[PDB]
């Protein structure tokens, strides 16, 4: 029981895992066992989704979050997102599930049987948190791994069947990406885009060529950065800027994950390219835009001239201008005029929505998709009654978009806290006052009084 | 000690797992009956005859929606005793008429008296100043104003809060729509006391925990405290400097700080009680007359205050027919206030 | 040293009457800009077309408001989430019409209050304190982010962010109940437990310590004179307090460890208010309170109403009246 109590380790049970900070072998165990839980969930959750799955109902009516992820990679789906074959869904779940037993094995072994520390046994695998060179080297290894991970996406997209392309001319379909975007002016341009409306920073990426080119860039950058970090030690300005400790490296990672969680929340909420509405359901903006399109269609069928119909406020009931003049849908959805979607773009001309096209060119499939998206807006209750908050029970629906946004906002938020907690604790422990104020060297007692 | 009284006193004050005292003869049966009345009603008792509502686990409700509901408006402010002229000793009828409501309200009222006596009694025996009892007058003023005064000013107990989670929410929304209770400055002081109290709680606990002295070796610092130790476990000096430089002002006197922690939320709850006494009489803070005159004369004048009254008028029109069934409200569709489309 | 090293020494000085610090260097100007804009707008701004329907709502005192009805009104729904700084407008006249001051206030305020939180970490480091006061502050700060930024983002518009005024805040609450049934949301319920509990334990702690002050003063002088700033001895007797409270309830229902007791005081309202913030931030994406509308059915299929259904009737009143000229189509989807 080598330091598995509070007396020996100085950490209570509820801070139990802090006991692992300088026990590299047991800590590797914690980490491998953990990845096992992650890979486990992925495989079992996939299988559960597949067992519950009725191919003829939209994914988004079935509470699915993982199958949609698989389908977007182009597996199991065809034109319009029609499921042609569930076996890839099956393969993905099984292989994760089996793999998790292997990780679980490794994890349990290192946690409970192998050497508690790895430094005596091996210098390659051993490490000291304060060894700035080892730390950048491990980091460097994982950067190379991550880089290859990005290149696997590219490989799928260009050489192994392509990706689901909601924008595919003629309708959504799987499509091979042959000409990915390589121009750094485009790829790095996205990073300098404003995060506000009508801009959306990286969340705006609206074609697979950009998505593929971006991953080409990232795979290269990450492998390059990995090599760099294996070959180098930190410059002195970096040495002087950071806390160098297990708890501090955790805190930096916590900050970056919180940030990524937040980005992920906005991605799934707004983006319908890498989260195709065919699989994930319509975005909030999209559903709101679909309602105005639905009634524009209905009312014009009834004889309404939609261009000159003045609403109660004096703005056009169906159509109006954005603050920069573009023709856009009216009523509340004015806010959503930045929305772009494949069922809608055919009506858009250079000035925004085109009245000639609206009067003549609205196809039945557009009416159909707008009705569908209007009635699958991402609104529902925690007990999964779909609808507005005043809706009666009947429809069992919460959009996959709401589940993915809400969960990840919560996760990103607590990770930010985790970051503040650990950053502040790491700072204090590095300076030596994390356990409290020395009663005989109280800093404030040595300072001039304020007034 | 001498006579039977003193012997009984001995027994009442024995140092046991649950202190009893004289206050216990009041406290314990009334707290237990109020609570078991609540669990019994929410588990098995309907509200069909009083409200047209299901309200128990037996009928299909869940934890958020069960309640012991108030009696029917036709009951007035009747005590509704089991043996009263309404139920006439019939237990089933009593349950059906709302008897559990007054049962829980009155036993709860006497239980609360008992608890505060228990606070005076324990403090007297331990030899402390009875500030805790005094602080508890705030919960008392709230219970009495809201569960007793309010419905006593209104037409009947029907308009008291019903004992349930969703029932209490309904009570909230009724107060917004009918009384515009958010506008009321006594409710606003209540909010300040409750949110200021919660702020004072968070900020004091966090300040102590972050100016602790190192009195141990453990990275968990809870063990480095001794109940009988002479010294402060944290530095008031550092805490004071920190807040002075952060916020501009700080406590310097620990007795002040703690007294202030009593004062703020207690005074808050007392203020909300006064407003609720006002609402017993429909003496609302509903309107600002100057806004109404300007708005009546100038159809382009709009403020958040006008916007919220349109919400209230929506709430009254839309909830009243099912919320006040004894009024037999029939509001044909054409009379209902509604904006465009919705 | 050099001019820069002197600057750094001053910025980070533990001796300034108000700590400045690196977070302070961002906090001071942003908070000043927000404060100044806020005050001027609250007093003098013209009416703002919040819902982008050319229906300007008067927020300021000079345009017919009092302290209670007054507000700085959210920016136009026609703007949505577009960034609307002063230089994006053709004139200040236009800027004011469209609610530009709101974006300026809330953006500088959010940056400033985030730095206010960083500054709290910073000073505690300079003073040799443990670092978590800033974490307690993350709870109100998260709540402010919920109503001024996250909610607007989810709903596609700053016109749905909380208005910067008293009656405005109530408007936001009421529309929120209609659209999300926030009362039936368990994160909001944890929030209530958090603030009601925070108040309670405040009244409790205040009262337990006060009741236990050691006799140090005359029958005439304030007992506060019994405590001196900086004294080493603890001014009340925690064993007597525990003796009381442990008997009020039962022994183990009471704290004798000041440290764990103060921890509980920090944790209870902070965690509950985190859930409140997260309630608002998750209803931002339309995951709403429990819906038990028509949940109880009789043998024939008659709906038997519950208190959830009476809640529904009140929510419906709010729904159909709110923004009475803004909807043209039957569903309110944001």
């Amino acid at each position: 029981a080598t330091n598995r109590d509070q007396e020996s380790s100085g950490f209570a049970w509820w801070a139990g895992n802090a006991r692992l900070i300088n026990l590299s072998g047991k800590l590797l165990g914690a980490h491998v066992a953990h990845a096992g839980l992650i890979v486990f969930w992925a495989g079992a959750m996939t299988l559960f989704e597949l067992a519950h799955f009725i191919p003829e109902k939209p994914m988004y009516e079935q509470g699915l979050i993982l199958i949609p992820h698989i389908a977007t990679l182009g597996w199991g789906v065809g034109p319009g997102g029609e499921v042609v074959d569930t076996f890839p869904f099956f393969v993905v779940g099984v292989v994760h599930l089996i793999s998790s037993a292997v990780l679980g094995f490794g994890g349990v072994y290192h946690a409970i049987r192998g050497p508690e520390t790895l430094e005596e046994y091996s210098s390659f695998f051993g490490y000291d948190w304060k060894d700035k060179n080892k730390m950048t080297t491990i980091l460097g290894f994982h950067l190379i791994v991550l880089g290859i991970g990005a290149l696997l996406l590219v490989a799928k997209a260009m050489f192994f069947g392509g990706l689901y392309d909601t924008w595919a001319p003629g309708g959504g379909d799987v499509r091979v990406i042959t000409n990915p975007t390589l121009d750094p002016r485009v790829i790095f341009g996205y990073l300098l885009k404003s995060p506000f409306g009508g801009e959306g920073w990286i969340v705006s990426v609206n074609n697979l060529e950009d998505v593929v080119g971006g991953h080409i860039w990232i795979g290269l950058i990450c492998i390059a950065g990995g090599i760099w970090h294996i070959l180098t030690t930190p410059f002195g300005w970096a040495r002087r800027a950071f806390i160098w400790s297990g708890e501090a490296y955790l805190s930096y990672s916590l900050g970056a994950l919180s940030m990524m969680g937040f980005i992920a929340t906005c991605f799934v909420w707004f983006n319908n390219t890498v989260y195709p509405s065919e699989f994930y359901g319509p975005t909030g903006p999209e559903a709101s835009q679909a309602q105005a399109m639905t009634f524009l269609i209905r009312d014009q069928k009834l004889g309404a001239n939609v261009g000159s119909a003045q609403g109660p406020t004096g703005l056009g009931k169906y159509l109006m201008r954005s603050p920069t003049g573009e023709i856009i849908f009216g009523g509340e959805t004015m806010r959503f005029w930045d929305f772009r979607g494949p069922w809608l773009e055919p009506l858009r001309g250079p000035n925004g929505l085109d009245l000639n096209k609206i009067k003549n060119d609205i196809q039945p499939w557009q009416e159909r998709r707008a009705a569908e998206y209007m009635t699958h807006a991402p609104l529902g209750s925690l007990n999964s009654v779909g609808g507005v908050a005043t809706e009666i029970n009947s429809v069992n629906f919460v959009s996959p978009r709401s589940w993915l946004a809400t969960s990840h906002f919560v996760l990103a938020f607590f990770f930010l806290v985790g970051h503040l907690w650990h950053a502040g604790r790491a700072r204090a422990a590095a300076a030596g006052f994390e356990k409290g104020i020395d009663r005989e060297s109280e800093p404030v007692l040595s300072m001039p009084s304020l007034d | 000690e001498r006579g039977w009284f003193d012997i009984l006193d001995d027994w009442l004050k024995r140092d046991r797992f649950v202190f009893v005292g004289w206050s216990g003869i009041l406290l314990f049966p009334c707290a237990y009956l109020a609570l078991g009345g609540w669990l019994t009603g929410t588990t098995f008792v309907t509200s069909w005859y009083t409200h047209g509502l299901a309200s128990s686990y037996l009928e299909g409700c869940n934890f958020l929606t069960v309640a012991v509901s108030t009696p029917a408006n036709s009951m007035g402010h009747s005590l509704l005793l089991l043996w009263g002229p309404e139920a006439q000793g019939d237990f089933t009828r009593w349950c059906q008429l709302g008897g559990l409501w007054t049962f829980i309200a009155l036993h709860g009222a006497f239980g609360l008296i008992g608890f505060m006596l228990r606070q005076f009694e324990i403090a007297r025996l331990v030899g402390v100043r009875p500030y805790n009892a005094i602080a508890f007058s705030a919960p008392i003023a709230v219970f009495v104003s809201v569960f007793l005064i309010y419905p006593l000013g209104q037409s009947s107990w029907f308009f008291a809060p019903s004992f349930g989670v969703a029932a209490i929410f309904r009570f909230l929304l009724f107060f917004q729509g009918f009384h515009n209770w958010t506008l009321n400055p006594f409710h606003m002081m209540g909010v300040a006391g409750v949110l200021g109290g919660a702020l004072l709680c968070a900020i004091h606990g966090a300040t102590v925990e972050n100016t602790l002295f190192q009195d141990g070796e453990g990275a968990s610092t809870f063990r480095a405290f001794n109940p009988t130790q002479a010294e402060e476990t944290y530095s008031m000096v550092t805490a004071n400097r920190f807040w002075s430089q952060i916020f501009g002002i700080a406590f310097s006197n620990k007795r002040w700080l703690h007294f202030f922690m009593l004062f703020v939320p207690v005074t808050g709850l007392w203020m909300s009680a006064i407003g609720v006494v006002g609402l017993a009489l429909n003496l609302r803070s509903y309107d600002f007359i100057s806004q109404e005159i300007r708005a009546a004369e100038d159809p382009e004048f709009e403020t958040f205050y006008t916007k919220n009254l349109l919400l209230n008028e929506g709430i009254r029109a839309w909830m009243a027919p099912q919320d006040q069934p004894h009024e037999n409200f029939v509001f044909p569709e054409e009379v209902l206030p509604r904006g465009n489309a919705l | 040293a050099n001019l820069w090293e002197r600057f750094c020494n001053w910025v980070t000085s533990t001796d300034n009457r108000l700590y400045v610090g690196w977070f302070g260097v961002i906090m001071i100007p942003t908070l000043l800009a927000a404060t100044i804009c806020f005050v001027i707008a609250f007093i003098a701004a013209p009416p703002v077309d919040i819902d982008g329907i050319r229906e300007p709502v008067s927020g300021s005192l000079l345009y017919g408001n009092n302290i209670i009805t007054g507000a700085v009104v959210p920016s136009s729904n026609a703007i949505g989430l577009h960034f609307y700084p002063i230089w994006e407008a053709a004139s200040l006249d236009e800027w004011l019409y469209n609610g530009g001051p709101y974006q300026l206030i809330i953006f500088h305020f959010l940056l400033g209050a985030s730095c206010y939180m960083g500054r709290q970490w910073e000073l505690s480091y300079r003073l040799g304190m443990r670092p978590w006061i800033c974490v307690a502050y993350s709870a109100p700060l998260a709540s402010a982010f919920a109503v001024f930024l996250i909610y607007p983002i989810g709903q596609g518009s700053f016109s749905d962010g909380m208005p910067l005024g008293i009656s405005g805040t109530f408007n936001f609450m009421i529309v929120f109940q209609a659209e999300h049934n926030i009362l039936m949301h368990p994160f909001h319920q944890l929030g209530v437990a958090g603030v009601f509990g925070g108040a309670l334990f405040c009244a409790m702690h205040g009262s337990l310590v006060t009741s236990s002050l050691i006799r140090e003063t005359t029958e005439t002088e304030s007992a506060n004179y019994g405590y001196k700033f900086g004294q080493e001895e603890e001014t009340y007797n925690i064993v007597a307090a525990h003796g009381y409270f442990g008997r009020l309830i039962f022994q183990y229902a009471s704290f004798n460890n000041s440290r764990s007791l103060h921890f509980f005081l920090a944790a209870w309202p902070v965690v509950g208010v985190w859930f409140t913030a997260l309630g608002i931030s998750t209803m931002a994406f339309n995951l709403n309170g429990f819906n038990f509308n028509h949940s109880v059915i009789d043998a024939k299929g008659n709906v038997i109403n519950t208190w959830a259904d009476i809640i529904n009737r009140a929510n419906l009143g709010m729904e159909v009246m709110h923004e009475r000229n803004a909807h043209n189509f039957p569903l309110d989807l944001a």
């Binding site: 009084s449 007034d451 | 002075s244 002002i249 310097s252 | 108000l18 900086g230």
Partner: peptide
């Protein structure tokens, strides 16, 4: 008169803030 009164009370509070901070009773460690 009404706006003036509101701004005047407000201004009195802001001034009261400045004195409470900068011209407080100094805390004395004795």
């Amino acid at each position: 008169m009404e706006t003036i009164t509101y701004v005047f009370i407000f201004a009195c509070i802001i001034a009261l803030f400045f004195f409470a901070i900068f011209f407080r009773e100094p805390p004395r460690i004795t």
